[PDB]
Amino acid sequence: MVVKFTDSQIQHLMEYGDNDWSEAEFEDAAARDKEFSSQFSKLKSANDKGLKDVIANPRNDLTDLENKIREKLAARGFIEVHTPIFVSKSALAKMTITEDHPLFKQVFWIDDKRALRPMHAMNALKVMRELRDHTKGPVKIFEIGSCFRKESKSSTHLEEFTMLNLAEMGPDGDPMEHLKMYIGDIMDAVGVEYTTSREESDVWVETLDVEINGTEVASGSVGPHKLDPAHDVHEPWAGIGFGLERLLMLKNGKSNARKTGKSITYLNGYKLD
Amino acid sequence: MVVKFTDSQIQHLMEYGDNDWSEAEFEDAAARDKEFSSQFSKLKSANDKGLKDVIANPRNDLTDLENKIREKLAARGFIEVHTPIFVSKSALAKMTITEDHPLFKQVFWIDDKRALRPMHAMNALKVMRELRDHTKGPVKIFEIGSCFRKESKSSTHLEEFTMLNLAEMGPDGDPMEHLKMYIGDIMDAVGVEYTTSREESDVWVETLDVEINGTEVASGSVGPHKLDPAHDVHEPWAGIGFGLERLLMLKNGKSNARKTGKSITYLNGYKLD
């Protein structure tokens, strides 16, 4: 008659760690509580030790990751942009984010037309379309900034999280080949092994699912999309958005099903409260 | 008897430039329209050459200023934090932002309880309180991120702008002296001359108005505020927030009536459309 950690114990453990304690089984209640107190003390000790080291040696892993990504993309000729968080309902639709899209329900709305961006794609292609007027070759940009999606039980994102989005319009070659190359640069900066799978699409020219340790991290997209509310850009282009806190969580290899993103309770992954 | 640029002509020049066109005087309307055509052509050509060079040599002046600020605050022992943009209506209150405060009407509201942060002060004080439980010396944190205020004619901010906020709680000395010290670092990173005026306040222990080229840029705060309709923390702390785009705009010494902040229209100060 095996027992597992209580729901309260699982909640406590996943706040201070990245392992998966949901499948740990024990002989009875006593062994369960004995192993919880041991593991919780170790996590609490490692958390407070790490937090003291951050005060003594200040650092921000997210900032460090962002600057390493900038170094990688700068070497590829990418321009970094800062675009507004507010996006229109029309721009969302032209990125296939219509009322039928499952992301439409997760969108925060400021008014009846302005919304908090759930992704950088809408603003990215607006900037690149303007840059085409100033160059005849590939347009390569990226942005690092907050995106907003209402929290659901299925998504491991917090309501606010930091997304890196990169895009190339009019590449000198296959867009998907270039996209794969740029994803390699991002995973190098994170320092993690990864897998990619080219998938057929009724919406895009092609999609590229990226997985780390068997967990899907992001999905890339190529070319103009095929949906009836079409986009203004008809040149071939590729882009992909990565949740940076998610990449930092999967950096150590483990995933604790704890939602990643902007939090006031965590600092370099260590619990403050 | 002397003519000056029309309101329409100044608006055309300000889209491509930062210079002060209000001081231009001309013999008659013919010389005024001649100079406008010449100046507008020069600005547009310089705008397109600069943008072309950004494609040739990617850079982002805002990112570079942020990293210069990090280099200077890291040498002072500051920790960079990333806090949520969503702040509670109560959190505004404990930070003096009540219905009586003129900033309350500029606040974007997502729902009844959550709002878009107009400053970093609320979250900064919360993070410093939690960091007090892990160290007993000075707590030095800072955040760079977007803040939101509904545009008004009195404010030179766009509705979204990048704000840098630094704060120190329980310093090893006078809070105001340490605050003036960190302000000097920021202005050194921006590379601009500034003035500070210690101003007594009925709200805070003391306020410090910061000005660049005669225009007030920011106002620092010291200690727990005295107003106290609700209540706050008892530990002395000092903090100040700067609009970073505004700092880049004021760096050249000239200030246009063009609002600063996040824009889809500009890239490194160059007009895209």
Coordinates of C-alpha atoms in Angstrom, one line a residue:
Chain A
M1 CA 0.0 0.0 0.0
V2 CA 2.2 2.8 -1.3
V3 CA 1.6 6.5 -0.7
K4 CA 3.1 9.6 -2.3
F5 CA 3.9 13.1 -1.2
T6 CA 0.8 15.1 -0.1
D7 CA -0.4 17.9 -2.3
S8 CA 1.0 20.4 0.3
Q9 CA 4.4 18.7 0.2
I10 CA 4.6 18.7 -3.6
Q11 CA 3.7 22.4 -3.6
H12 CA 6.4 23.1 -1.0
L13 CA 9.1 21.1 -2.8
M14 CA 8.4 22.6 -6.3
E15 CA 8.7 26.1 -4.9
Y16 CA 12.3 25.5 -3.8
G17 CA 13.5 23.1 -6.5
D18 CA 13.4 21.9 -10.1
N19 CA 13.1 18.2 -9.7
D20 CA 9.9 16.2 -10.2
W21 CA 8.6 14.9 -6.8
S22 CA 5.1 14.0 -8.1
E23 CA 6.0 10.3 -8.7
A24 CA 8.0 9.6 -5.5
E25 CA 6.4 6.7 -3.6
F26 CA 6.9 5.6 0.0
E27 CA 6.0 2.7 2.2
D28 CA 3.6 4.6 4.5
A29 CA 2.8 8.1 5.8
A30 CA 5.9 8.1 8.1
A31 CA 8.4 7.4 5.4
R32 CA 6.7 10.0 3.2
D33 CA 7.0 12.7 5.9
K34 CA 10.5 11.7 6.8
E35 CA 11.7 12.0 3.2
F36 CA 9.9 15.3 2.8
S37 CA 11.5 16.9 5.8
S38 CA 14.9 15.7 4.6
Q39 CA 14.4 17.0 1.1
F40 CA 12.8 20.2 2.1
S41 CA 15.7 21.1 4.5
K42 CA 18.2 20.4 1.7
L43 CA 16.2 22.6 -0.7
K44 CA 15.7 25.3 1.9
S45 CA 19.4 25.2 2.7
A46 CA 20.5 25.3 -1.0
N47 CA 18.0 28.2 -1.6
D48 CA 19.2 30.4 1.3
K49 CA 22.9 29.6 0.5
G50 CA 22.4 30.6 -3.1
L51 CA 20.5 33.7 -2.2
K52 CA 23.3 34.9 0.2
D53 CA 25.8 34.3 -2.6
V54 CA 23.8 36.6 -4.9
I55 CA 23.8 39.4 -2.4
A56 CA 27.5 39.0 -1.9
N57 CA 28.2 38.5 -5.6
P58 CA 25.4 40.3 -7.5
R59 CA 24.3 38.8 -10.8
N60 CA 21.2 38.4 -13.0
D61 CA 21.1 35.1 -14.9
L62 CA 18.3 36.5 -17.2
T63 CA 20.4 39.6 -18.1
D64 CA 23.5 37.4 -18.6
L65 CA 21.5 35.1 -20.9
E66 CA 20.1 38.1 -22.8
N67 CA 23.5 39.6 -23.4
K68 CA 25.0 36.3 -24.6
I69 CA 22.1 36.0 -27.0
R70 CA 22.7 39.6 -28.2
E71 CA 26.4 38.6 -28.9
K72 CA 25.2 35.6 -30.9
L73 CA 22.7 37.5 -33.0
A74 CA 24.9 40.6 -33.4
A75 CA 27.5 38.3 -35.1
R76 CA 24.7 37.2 -37.5
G77 CA 23.8 40.8 -38.4
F78 CA 20.7 41.0 -36.4
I79 CA 19.3 44.4 -35.2
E80 CA 17.7 44.6 -31.8
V81 CA 14.4 46.5 -31.6
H82 CA 12.2 47.8 -28.8
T83 CA 8.5 47.8 -29.8
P84 CA 5.4 48.7 -27.8
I85 CA 3.6 46.1 -25.7
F86 CA 0.3 47.4 -26.9
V87 CA -0.9 45.7 -30.1
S88 CA -4.1 46.1 -32.1
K89 CA -6.8 43.4 -32.6
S90 CA -6.2 43.7 -36.4
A91 CA -2.4 43.1 -36.1
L92 CA -3.3 40.0 -34.0
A93 CA -5.7 38.8 -36.7
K94 CA -3.1 39.3 -39.5
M95 CA -0.8 37.0 -37.4
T96 CA -3.6 34.3 -37.5
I97 CA -4.6 35.3 -33.9
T98 CA -8.3 35.5 -34.6
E99 CA -11.2 34.7 -32.3
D100 CA -11.0 31.0 -33.4
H101 CA -7.3 30.9 -32.3
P102 CA -6.7 29.3 -28.9
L103 CA -4.4 32.1 -27.9
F104 CA -7.1 34.7 -28.5
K105 CA -8.8 33.7 -25.2
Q106 CA -5.6 34.3 -23.3
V107 CA -5.0 37.9 -24.5
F108 CA -5.1 40.7 -22.0
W109 CA -7.2 43.6 -23.4
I110 CA -6.6 47.3 -22.5
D111 CA -9.6 48.5 -24.4
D112 CA -11.8 47.2 -27.2
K113 CA -8.9 47.4 -29.7
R114 CA -5.6 47.6 -27.8
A115 CA -4.1 44.5 -26.2
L116 CA -1.0 43.4 -24.4
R117 CA 1.1 41.5 -26.9
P118 CA 1.2 37.7 -26.4
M119 CA 4.1 37.5 -28.8
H120 CA 6.6 39.7 -30.7
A121 CA 5.6 38.6 -34.2
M122 CA 3.1 41.4 -34.9
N123 CA 5.5 44.2 -34.2
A124 CA 8.5 42.3 -35.7
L125 CA 7.0 42.1 -39.2
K126 CA 5.9 45.8 -39.0
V127 CA 9.5 46.9 -38.4
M128 CA 11.0 44.6 -41.0
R129 CA 8.5 45.7 -43.7
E130 CA 9.7 49.3 -43.1
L131 CA 13.3 48.3 -43.2
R132 CA 12.8 46.8 -46.7
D133 CA 12.5 50.4 -47.9
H134 CA 16.1 51.0 -46.8
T135 CA 17.9 47.8 -47.9
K136 CA 17.5 45.2 -50.7
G137 CA 18.9 42.2 -48.8
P138 CA 17.9 40.2 -45.7
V139 CA 16.3 42.0 -42.9
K140 CA 17.3 40.4 -39.5
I141 CA 15.8 41.7 -36.2
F142 CA 15.1 40.4 -32.8
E143 CA 13.5 41.7 -29.6
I144 CA 13.7 40.7 -26.0
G145 CA 10.8 41.9 -23.8
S146 CA 7.7 41.0 -21.9
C147 CA 4.7 39.2 -23.4
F148 CA 1.4 38.5 -21.7
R149 CA -0.9 35.5 -21.8
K150 CA -3.6 34.7 -19.3
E151 CA -2.6 31.7 -17.2
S152 CA -4.2 28.3 -18.0
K153 CA -3.7 24.8 -16.5
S154 CA -2.1 23.6 -19.8
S155 CA 0.6 26.3 -20.2
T156 CA 3.7 26.5 -18.0
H157 CA 4.0 30.2 -18.6
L158 CA 3.2 32.8 -16.0
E159 CA 0.9 35.7 -17.1
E160 CA 4.0 37.8 -17.8
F161 CA 7.2 36.2 -19.2
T162 CA 10.3 37.4 -21.1
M163 CA 10.2 36.3 -24.7
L164 CA 13.1 36.5 -27.2
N165 CA 11.8 36.6 -30.7
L166 CA 14.0 36.7 -33.8
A167 CA 13.0 36.9 -37.4
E168 CA 14.6 37.2 -40.9
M169 CA 12.8 38.5 -43.9
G170 CA 14.1 37.9 -47.5
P171 CA 17.0 35.6 -46.6
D172 CA 19.7 34.7 -49.1
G173 CA 18.7 31.0 -49.0
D174 CA 16.2 28.7 -47.5
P175 CA 14.4 30.4 -44.6
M176 CA 14.1 27.2 -42.6
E177 CA 17.8 26.5 -43.0
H178 CA 18.6 29.9 -41.7
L179 CA 16.1 29.6 -38.8
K180 CA 17.7 26.3 -37.7
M181 CA 21.1 28.1 -37.6
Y182 CA 19.8 30.9 -35.4
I183 CA 18.2 28.4 -33.0
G184 CA 21.6 26.7 -32.7
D185 CA 23.0 30.1 -31.7
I186 CA 20.3 30.5 -29.0
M187 CA 20.8 27.0 -27.6
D188 CA 24.6 27.6 -27.5
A189 CA 24.1 30.7 -25.4
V190 CA 21.8 28.8 -23.1
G191 CA 24.2 25.8 -23.3
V192 CA 21.7 23.0 -23.7
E193 CA 21.2 20.1 -26.1
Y194 CA 18.0 20.3 -28.2
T195 CA 16.1 18.6 -30.9
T196 CA 14.1 20.1 -33.8
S197 CA 11.4 18.6 -36.0
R198 CA 10.1 20.0 -39.3
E199 CA 6.3 19.8 -39.3
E200 CA 3.8 20.3 -42.1
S201 CA 1.3 23.1 -41.7
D202 CA -2.0 24.2 -43.1
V203 CA -1.2 27.7 -41.8
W204 CA 2.5 28.3 -42.4
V205 CA 4.9 27.3 -45.1
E206 CA 6.4 25.0 -42.5
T207 CA 6.8 24.8 -38.7
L208 CA 9.8 23.8 -36.6
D209 CA 9.2 22.4 -33.1
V210 CA 12.1 22.8 -30.7
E211 CA 12.4 20.5 -27.7
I212 CA 14.7 20.3 -24.8
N213 CA 14.9 17.0 -22.8
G214 CA 11.8 15.9 -24.6
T215 CA 9.8 19.0 -23.6
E216 CA 8.7 21.3 -26.4
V217 CA 10.2 24.7 -25.9
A218 CA 9.0 26.7 -28.9
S219 CA 7.7 26.4 -32.4
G220 CA 9.1 28.3 -35.4
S221 CA 7.3 29.4 -38.5
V222 CA 8.4 30.1 -42.1
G223 CA 7.2 32.3 -44.9
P224 CA 3.9 34.2 -45.1
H225 CA 1.0 32.4 -43.7
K226 CA -1.8 31.0 -45.8
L227 CA -4.9 32.1 -43.8
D228 CA -7.6 34.3 -45.4
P229 CA -7.0 37.4 -43.1
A230 CA -3.6 37.6 -44.8
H231 CA -0.5 39.5 -43.7
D232 CA 0.9 42.6 -45.4
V233 CA 4.3 41.0 -46.0
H234 CA 4.5 38.5 -48.9
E235 CA 8.3 37.9 -48.9
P236 CA 9.6 34.7 -47.4
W237 CA 10.4 35.0 -43.7
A238 CA 11.2 32.9 -40.7
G239 CA 10.8 33.6 -37.0
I240 CA 10.6 31.9 -33.6
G241 CA 10.0 33.1 -30.1
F242 CA 11.6 31.6 -27.0
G243 CA 10.5 32.1 -23.4
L244 CA 13.8 33.0 -21.7
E245 CA 12.8 32.1 -18.1
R246 CA 11.7 28.7 -19.5
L247 CA 15.1 28.3 -21.2
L248 CA 16.8 29.1 -17.9
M249 CA 14.5 26.6 -16.0
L250 CA 15.3 23.8 -18.6
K251 CA 19.0 24.9 -18.5
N252 CA 19.7 22.6 -15.6
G253 CA 17.8 19.8 -17.4
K254 CA 15.0 19.4 -14.9
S255 CA 11.4 20.7 -15.1
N256 CA 9.3 21.0 -11.9
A257 CA 6.0 22.0 -13.7
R258 CA 6.4 25.4 -11.9
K259 CA 5.3 28.3 -14.1
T260 CA 8.1 30.5 -15.4
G261 CA 8.1 34.2 -16.2
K262 CA 8.1 37.5 -14.3
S263 CA 7.8 36.9 -10.6
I264 CA 8.3 39.0 -7.5
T265 CA 8.9 35.9 -5.4
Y266 CA 12.0 34.6 -7.2
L267 CA 15.5 36.0 -7.8
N268 CA 18.0 34.1 -10.0
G269 CA 15.7 31.1 -9.4
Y270 CA 16.0 31.3 -5.6
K271 CA 12.8 31.7 -3.5
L272 CA 12.7 35.0 -1.6
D273 CA 9.6 34.3 0.6
Chain B
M1 CA 9.4 92.3 -39.4
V2 CA 10.9 88.8 -39.1
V3 CA 8.9 85.5 -39.6
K4 CA 9.4 82.1 -38.0
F5 CA 8.6 78.5 -39.0
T6 CA 4.9 77.6 -39.1
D7 CA 3.5 75.0 -36.7
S8 CA 3.2 72.5 -39.6
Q9 CA 6.8 73.0 -40.6
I10 CA 8.1 72.5 -37.1
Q11 CA 6.2 69.3 -36.9
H12 CA 7.7 68.1 -40.1
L13 CA 11.2 68.9 -38.8
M14 CA 10.7 67.2 -35.4
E15 CA 9.8 63.9 -37.0
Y16 CA 13.4 63.6 -38.4
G17 CA 15.3 65.7 -35.8
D18 CA 15.9 66.8 -32.3
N19 CA 17.0 70.4 -32.9
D20 CA 15.3 73.5 -31.7
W21 CA 13.5 75.0 -34.7
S22 CA 11.5 77.5 -32.6
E23 CA 14.5 80.0 -32.6
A24 CA 14.7 80.2 -36.4
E25 CA 14.0 83.7 -37.7
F26 CA 13.8 84.7 -41.3
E27 CA 13.5 87.9 -43.4
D28 CA 10.2 86.9 -45.0
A29 CA 8.0 83.9 -45.8
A30 CA 9.9 83.2 -49.0
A31 CA 13.2 82.7 -47.1
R32 CA 11.4 80.7 -44.4
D33 CA 9.9 78.2 -47.0
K34 CA 13.2 78.0 -48.7
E35 CA 15.1 77.1 -45.5
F36 CA 12.4 74.6 -44.5
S37 CA 12.7 72.7 -47.8
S38 CA 16.5 72.8 -47.4
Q39 CA 16.5 71.7 -43.8
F40 CA 13.8 69.1 -44.3
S41 CA 15.7 67.5 -47.2
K42 CA 18.9 67.5 -45.1
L43 CA 17.2 65.8 -42.2
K44 CA 15.5 63.2 -44.4
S45 CA 18.7 62.3 -46.2
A46 CA 20.6 62.1 -42.9
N47 CA 17.8 60.0 -41.5
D48 CA 18.0 57.5 -44.4
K49 CA 21.8 57.3 -44.3
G50 CA 21.8 56.6 -40.5
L51 CA 19.2 53.9 -40.9
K52 CA 21.2 52.3 -43.7
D53 CA 24.3 52.3 -41.5
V54 CA 22.2 50.6 -38.7
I55 CA 21.5 47.8 -41.2
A56 CA 25.1 47.7 -42.1
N57 CA 26.3 48.0 -38.5
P58 CA 23.6 46.8 -36.1
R59 CA 23.3 48.6 -32.8
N60 CA 20.7 49.6 -30.2
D61 CA 21.5 52.8 -28.2
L62 CA 19.0 51.9 -25.5
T63 CA 20.5 48.5 -24.9
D64 CA 24.0 50.1 -24.8
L65 CA 22.9 52.7 -22.2
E66 CA 21.3 49.9 -20.2
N67 CA 24.5 47.9 -20.1
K68 CA 26.6 51.0 -19.2
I69 CA 24.2 51.6 -16.3
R70 CA 24.5 47.9 -15.2
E71 CA 28.3 48.2 -15.3
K72 CA 28.3 51.2 -13.0
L73 CA 25.6 49.9 -10.5
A74 CA 27.2 46.4 -10.4
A75 CA 30.4 48.1 -9.1
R76 CA 28.3 49.6 -6.3
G77 CA 26.9 46.2 -5.2
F78 CA 23.5 46.6 -6.8
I79 CA 21.4 43.5 -7.7
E80 CA 19.3 43.7 -10.9
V81 CA 15.8 42.4 -10.4
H82 CA 13.0 41.6 -12.8
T83 CA 9.5 42.2 -11.3
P84 CA 6.0 41.9 -12.8
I85 CA 4.4 44.8 -14.7
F86 CA 1.1 44.0 -12.9
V87 CA 0.7 45.9 -9.6
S88 CA -2.2 45.8 -7.2
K89 CA -4.4 48.8 -6.5
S90 CA -3.3 48.5 -2.9
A91 CA 0.4 48.6 -3.9
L92 CA -0.2 52.0 -5.6
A93 CA -1.7 53.2 -2.3
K94 CA 1.2 52.3 -0.1
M95 CA 3.4 54.1 -2.6
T96 CA 1.5 57.3 -2.2
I97 CA -0.3 56.7 -5.5
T98 CA -3.9 57.4 -4.3
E99 CA -6.8 59.2 -5.9
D100 CA -5.3 62.4 -4.6
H101 CA -2.1 61.8 -6.5
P102 CA -1.9 63.2 -10.0
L103 CA -0.4 60.0 -11.3
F104 CA -3.5 58.0 -10.5
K105 CA -5.4 59.1 -13.6
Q106 CA -2.5 58.1 -15.9
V107 CA -2.6 54.5 -14.6
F108 CA -3.7 51.8 -17.0
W109 CA -6.1 49.3 -15.5
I110 CA -6.3 45.7 -16.8
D111 CA -9.1 44.7 -14.4
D112 CA -10.5 45.7 -11.0
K113 CA -7.4 44.7 -9.0
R114 CA -4.4 44.6 -11.5
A115 CA -2.9 47.6 -13.1
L116 CA 0.0 48.4 -15.4
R117 CA 2.9 49.7 -13.3
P118 CA 3.5 53.5 -13.8
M119 CA 6.8 53.1 -11.9
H120 CA 9.1 50.4 -10.3
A121 CA 8.8 51.7 -6.7
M122 CA 6.0 49.3 -5.6
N123 CA 7.9 46.2 -6.6
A124 CA 11.3 47.5 -5.6
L125 CA 10.3 48.1 -2.0
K126 CA 8.7 44.6 -1.9
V127 CA 11.8 42.9 -3.1
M128 CA 14.0 44.9 -0.7
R129 CA 11.8 43.9 2.2
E130 CA 12.2 40.2 1.3
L131 CA 15.9 40.6 0.8
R132 CA 16.2 42.1 4.3
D133 CA 15.3 38.6 5.6
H134 CA 18.6 37.3 4.0
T135 CA 21.0 40.1 4.7
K136 CA 21.4 42.8 7.4
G137 CA 23.7 45.2 5.5
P138 CA 22.6 47.6 2.8
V139 CA 20.0 46.3 0.2
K140 CA 20.8 47.7 -3.2
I141 CA 18.6 46.7 -6.2
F142 CA 17.7 48.2 -9.5
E143 CA 15.3 47.4 -12.4
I144 CA 15.1 48.3 -16.0
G145 CA 11.8 47.7 -17.7
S146 CA 8.7 49.2 -19.2
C147 CA 6.3 51.5 -17.3
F148 CA 2.9 52.8 -18.4
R149 CA 1.2 56.2 -18.0
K150 CA -1.7 57.5 -20.1
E151 CA -0.4 60.2 -22.3
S152 CA -1.3 63.8 -21.3
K153 CA -0.1 67.2 -22.6
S154 CA 1.8 67.9 -19.4
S155 CA 3.9 64.7 -19.7
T156 CA 6.6 64.2 -22.3
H157 CA 6.3 60.4 -22.0
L158 CA 4.7 58.2 -24.5
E159 CA 2.2 55.7 -23.0
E160 CA 4.9 53.1 -22.6
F161 CA 8.6 53.9 -21.8
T162 CA 11.6 52.2 -20.4
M163 CA 12.3 53.2 -16.8
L164 CA 15.4 52.6 -14.7
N165 CA 14.8 52.6 -11.0
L166 CA 17.4 52.1 -8.3
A167 CA 16.7 51.8 -4.6
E168 CA 18.8 51.3 -1.5
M169 CA 17.3 50.3 1.9
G170 CA 19.2 50.6 5.2
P171 CA 22.3 52.3 3.7
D172 CA 25.6 52.6 5.6
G173 CA 25.3 56.4 5.7
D174 CA 22.9 59.2 4.8
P175 CA 20.2 57.9 2.3
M176 CA 20.2 61.2 0.4
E177 CA 24.0 61.3 0.0
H178 CA 24.1 57.7 -1.3
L179 CA 21.2 58.6 -3.7
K180 CA 23.1 61.6 -5.1
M181 CA 26.1 59.2 -5.5
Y182 CA 24.1 56.7 -7.7
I183 CA 22.5 59.5 -9.7
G184 CA 26.0 60.7 -10.6
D185 CA 26.8 57.2 -12.0
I186 CA 23.7 57.2 -14.2
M187 CA 24.5 60.7 -15.6
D188 CA 28.1 59.6 -16.2
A189 CA 26.8 56.6 -18.2
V190 CA 24.4 58.8 -20.1
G191 CA 27.2 61.4 -20.5
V192 CA 25.3 64.6 -19.7
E193 CA 25.6 67.4 -17.2
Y194 CA 22.9 67.7 -14.6
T195 CA 21.7 69.5 -11.5
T196 CA 20.1 68.3 -8.3
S197 CA 18.0 70.3 -5.8
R198 CA 17.2 69.0 -2.3
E199 CA 13.6 69.8 -1.7
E200 CA 11.7 69.4 1.5
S201 CA 8.4 67.5 1.3
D202 CA 5.4 66.8 3.4
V203 CA 5.0 63.4 1.8
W204 CA 8.6 62.0 2.1
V205 CA 11.5 62.6 4.4
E206 CA 13.0 64.6 1.5
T207 CA 12.8 64.8 -2.3
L208 CA 15.6 65.4 -4.8
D209 CA 14.6 67.0 -8.1
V210 CA 17.0 66.1 -10.9
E211 CA 17.3 68.4 -13.9
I212 CA 19.2 68.2 -17.2
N213 CA 19.6 71.3 -19.4
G214 CA 17.0 73.1 -17.3
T215 CA 14.2 70.5 -17.6
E216 CA 13.3 68.4 -14.6
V217 CA 14.1 64.7 -15.5
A218 CA 13.3 62.9 -12.3
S219 CA 12.6 63.3 -8.6
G220 CA 14.2 61.1 -6.0
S221 CA 12.6 60.0 -2.7
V222 CA 14.1 59.3 0.7
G223 CA 12.9 57.2 3.7
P224 CA 9.4 56.0 4.5
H225 CA 6.8 58.5 3.3
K226 CA 5.0 60.6 6.0
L227 CA 1.5 60.8 4.3
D228 CA 0.6 57.3 5.4
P229 CA -3.1 56.8 4.7
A230 CA -2.3 53.1 5.0
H231 CA 1.2 52.1 6.3
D232 CA 4.6 51.2 5.0
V233 CA 8.0 49.8 6.1
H234 CA 10.0 51.4 8.9
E235 CA 13.5 51.0 7.4
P236 CA 14.9 54.1 5.8
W237 CA 15.3 53.7 2.0
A238 CA 16.1 56.0 -1.0
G239 CA 15.1 55.5 -4.6
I240 CA 14.8 57.3 -7.9
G241 CA 13.5 56.3 -11.4
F242 CA 14.6 57.6 -14.8
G243 CA 13.0 57.4 -18.2
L244 CA 15.8 56.0 -20.3
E245 CA 14.5 57.1 -23.7
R246 CA 14.2 60.6 -22.2
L247 CA 17.8 60.5 -21.1
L248 CA 18.9 59.5 -24.6
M249 CA 16.8 62.3 -26.0
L250 CA 18.2 64.9 -23.6
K251 CA 21.8 63.7 -24.1
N252 CA 22.5 65.9 -27.1
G253 CA 21.4 68.9 -25.0
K254 CA 18.4 69.7 -27.2
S255 CA 14.8 68.6 -26.3
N256 CA 12.1 68.3 -28.9
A257 CA 8.3 68.3 -28.2
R258 CA 8.4 64.7 -29.4
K259 CA 7.3 62.3 -26.7
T260 CA 9.9 59.7 -25.6
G261 CA 9.3 56.0 -25.0
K262 CA 8.4 52.8 -26.9
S263 CA 7.6 53.5 -30.5
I264 CA 7.0 51.3 -33.6
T265 CA 7.9 54.4 -35.7
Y266 CA 11.6 54.9 -34.8
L267 CA 14.8 52.8 -34.6
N268 CA 17.8 54.2 -32.8
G269 CA 16.1 57.6 -33.2
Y270 CA 15.7 57.3 -37.0
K271 CA 12.2 57.5 -38.5
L272 CA 11.2 54.2 -40.1
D273 CA 8.1 55.3 -42.1

